[PDB]
Scaffold this active site. Sequence first.
Site, PDB file in Angstrom:
ATOM      1  N   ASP A   1       0.850  -1.220   0.000  1.00  0.00           N
ATOM      2  CA  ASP A   1       0.000   0.000   0.000  1.00  0.00           C
ATOM      3  C   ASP A   1       0.881   1.264   0.000  1.00  0.00           C
ATOM      4  O   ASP A   1       0.515   2.202  -0.730  1.00  0.00           O
ATOM      5  CB  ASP A   1      -0.976  -0.015   1.192  1.00  0.00           C
ATOM      6  CG  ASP A   1      -2.322  -0.681   0.921  1.00  0.00           C
ATOM      7  OD1 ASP A   1      -2.466  -1.362  -0.124  1.00  0.00           O
ATOM      8  OD2 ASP A   1      -3.251  -0.477   1.734  1.00  0.00           O
TER       9      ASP A   1
ATOM     10  N   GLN B   1       7.011   7.482 -10.463  1.00  0.00           N
ATOM     11  CA  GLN B   1       6.282   8.593  -9.762  1.00  0.00           C
ATOM     12  C   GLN B   1       7.083   9.162  -8.576  1.00  0.00           C
ATOM     13  O   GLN B   1       6.700  10.281  -8.131  1.00  0.00           O
ATOM     14  CB  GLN B   1       4.920   8.131  -9.228  1.00  0.00           C
ATOM     15  CG  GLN B   1       3.831   8.161 -10.277  1.00  0.00           C
ATOM     16  CD  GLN B   1       2.496   7.674  -9.734  1.00  0.00           C
ATOM     17  OE1 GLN B   1       2.321   6.497  -9.369  1.00  0.00           O
ATOM     18  NE2 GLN B   1       1.553   8.597  -9.628  1.00  0.00           N
TER      19      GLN B   1
ATOM     20  N   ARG C   1       4.034   2.107 -10.910  1.00  0.00           N
ATOM     21  CA  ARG C   1       4.304   0.647 -10.987  1.00  0.00           C
ATOM     22  C   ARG C   1       4.381   0.209 -12.461  1.00  0.00           C
ATOM     23  O   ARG C   1       5.302  -0.568 -12.841  1.00  0.00           O
ATOM     24  CB  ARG C   1       3.243  -0.144 -10.222  1.00  0.00           C
ATOM     25  CG  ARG C   1       3.150   0.215  -8.748  1.00  0.00           C
ATOM     26  CD  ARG C   1       2.006  -0.522  -8.085  1.00  0.00           C
ATOM     27  NE  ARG C   1       1.638   0.129  -6.847  1.00  0.00           N
ATOM     28  CZ  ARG C   1       0.602  -0.235  -6.073  1.00  0.00           C
ATOM     29  NH1 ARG C   1      -0.196  -1.241  -6.437  1.00  0.00           N
ATOM     30  NH2 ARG C   1       0.368   0.446  -4.949  1.00  0.00           N
ATOM     31  N   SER C   2       3.490   0.701 -13.313  1.00  0.00           N
ATOM     32  CA  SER C   2       3.482   0.364 -14.751  1.00  0.00           C
ATOM     33  C   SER C   2       4.813   0.808 -15.393  1.00  0.00           C
ATOM     34  O   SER C   2       5.378   0.056 -16.257  1.00  0.00           O
ATOM     35  CB  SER C   2       2.293   1.029 -15.451  1.00  0.00           C
ATOM     36  OG  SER C   2       1.037   0.527 -14.992  1.00  0.00           O
TER      37      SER C   2
ATOM     38  N   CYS D   1      -1.745   0.112 -13.646  1.00  0.00           N
ATOM     39  CA  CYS D   1      -1.846   0.129 -12.177  1.00  0.00           C
ATOM     40  C   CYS D   1      -3.048   1.026 -11.866  1.00  0.00           C
ATOM     41  O   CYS D   1      -4.049   0.909 -12.618  1.00  0.00           O
ATOM     42  CB  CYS D   1      -0.513   0.555 -11.572  1.00  0.00           C
ATOM     43  SG  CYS D   1       0.263   2.013 -12.359  1.00  0.00           S
TER      44      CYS D   1
END
Length: 284
Positions: free
Chosen positions: A181, A262, A221-222, A215
């Site tokens: 998370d 990110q 994450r992608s 994602c």
Amino acid sequence: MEMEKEFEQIDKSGSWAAIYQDIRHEASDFPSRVAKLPKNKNRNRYRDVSPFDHSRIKLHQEDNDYINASLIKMEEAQRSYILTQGPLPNTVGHFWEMVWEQKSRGVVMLNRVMEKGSLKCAQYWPQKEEKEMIFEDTNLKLTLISEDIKSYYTVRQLELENLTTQETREILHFHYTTWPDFGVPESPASFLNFLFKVRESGSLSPEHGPVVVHCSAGIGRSGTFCLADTCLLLMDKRKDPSSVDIKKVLLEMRKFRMGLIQTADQLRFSYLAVIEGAKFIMGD
Ligand SMILES: O=C(O)c1ccc2[nH]ccc2c1
């Protein structure tokens, strides 16, 4: 190893934040005028994440051709990826239309439907064999064929039927279920195991359309998934694997979709994944 001594040089100096902001400063800026049209406001999950007009995927319909998805085309590596946001309640039928039209074999999902107590994407695939899904807006049927649940990921076999022509295809769903998370995994071992499972399936190979990767926003994450894949492929292909510069590959990919990677922690995790995966490019 070049990359690992850079990693150690950045880690010992603690300059991850400074490296990351330099990438943000040099990254491409291209127009996203279609994404910002008023008719498309409910087709976008996040106001600040849009596909560039030059690289966006177009839906094959005359009504409205817009989806929040980009084609990342890596010329030297000879790999293509589609990066897209987690589908919304009103874009689940657009999503499967894109998978059909682009001839994709694989869908890669790097998020859970609920994280941090909030919904990060729609429940867009069927959970029981005998309860199939029909997308009336795009004339498609989707059936769960089989499910293989492991500790770090689940693989699903799906059947997608174009109800207009009665053609069917098998789509593989690769769901990485254990990204935390907050922050990034402590070890990249389970992420690298997942990437090699997608590779072994044929989903990343030139005899199919591009893999669809998502994602929640389709950049974090992608971003990590396609950067690690392309960097390891380039090490395999070049006479001097030590020439592979992860910062330069990332800026090339950011010509095709904004914001890939990110945070400074996702950038460090990407280095760690490539470094560890490289051991296998090292004939072991
Ligand atoms: O940086 C290096 O020395 C080096 C040498 C061989 C390699 N094979 C894959 C990565 C890699 C790095």
